[PDB]
Amino acid sequence: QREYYLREQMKAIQKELGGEDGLSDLEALRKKIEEVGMPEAVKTKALKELDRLERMQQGSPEATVARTYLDWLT
């Protein structure tokens, strides 16, 4: 029970210092998609690809392909 409490407080202090993300990553990519360009069909294609990317979990080898493709489009 006490080491359960230990991980509870490490999550609380985790958001208190490194849950700071008023700067984020994927929604920063969404804003970057919105502000540059674009033609409208390319913009809808990129937003569908972004939703597909955020639905899956990270570390998978297909998420790296989707991330690199959005990096090249932006």
Binding site: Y5, Q9, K11, A12, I13, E16
Partner: protein, 219 residues
């Protein structure tokens, strides 16, 4: 000029301007205390540092020391001596002679005169409400409460600072940095800063504890 020898402490910080017990329990400082009583019976106590050893050395000490007084000394049959002291001031060492026993010639003291006590008074009242609020919120340090009505009328910043830091606990290094400066308002400002550190510390720990209970609730 009241020659005073170099006598270290055990582990305890003794604050000036404060009637304080002194419990000399080191067997190789009994000689130091006894020949310090051969110097009009006032004792030059040096604060004890980085891990406590029993090695008298001219290079393994420091030269800052409080000046304690012998009223009367209670003896125990194991090398343990009790003396109720009241410190006058902080003193230095310019010329050191090795031993045993190690001797030290001090000079004129770090003396200061109070000018412009009104800014000091504003500093006194903000430090006043500062320690009043910390005693009012946090009781696991188990201090007394009922003495403020007599010492409220005292007008001396060194005695007020030593009174507050005497009954309060933190690490030894900034205790001696409260001791080992020359300015007198600046240390009041820095104990205000350490009080503000205490304030933000209990604010953040109750904040993360609150968040822990909400995470418990969520789980």
């Amino acid at each position: 000029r009241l020659e005073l020898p170099v006598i270290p402490l055990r582990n305890t910080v003794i604050l000036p301007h404060t009637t304080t017990p002194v419990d000399v329990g080191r067997a190789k400082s009994k000689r130091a205390v006894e020949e310090a009583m051969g110097a009009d019976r006032l004792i030059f106590l040096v604060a004890q540092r980085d891990p406590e050893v029993d090695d008298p050395a001219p290079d393994d000490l420091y030269t800052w020391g409080v000046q304690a007084v012998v009223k009367q000394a209670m003896r125990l049959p194991d090398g343990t001596l009790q003396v109720m002291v009241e410190a006058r001031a902080r003193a230095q060492v310019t010329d050191y002679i090795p031993g045993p026993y190690l001797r030290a010639r001090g000079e004129v003291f770090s003396e200061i005169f109070p000018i412009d006590e009104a800014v000091v008074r504003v500093l006194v009242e903000e430090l006043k409400e500062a320690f009043e609020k910390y005693v009012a919120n946090h009781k696991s340090l188990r201090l007394d409460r009922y003495q403020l009505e007599a010492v409220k009328g005292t007008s001396d910043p060194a005695m007020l600072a030593d009174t507050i830091a005497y009954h309060a606990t933190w690490t030894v290094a900034e205790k001696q940095e409260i001791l080992e400066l020359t300015d007198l308002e600046a240390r009041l400002k820095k104990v205000l800063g350490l009080l503000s550190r205490d304030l933000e510390r209990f604010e953040l720990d109750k904040r993360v504890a609150q968040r822990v209970k909400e995470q418990m609730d969520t789980n």
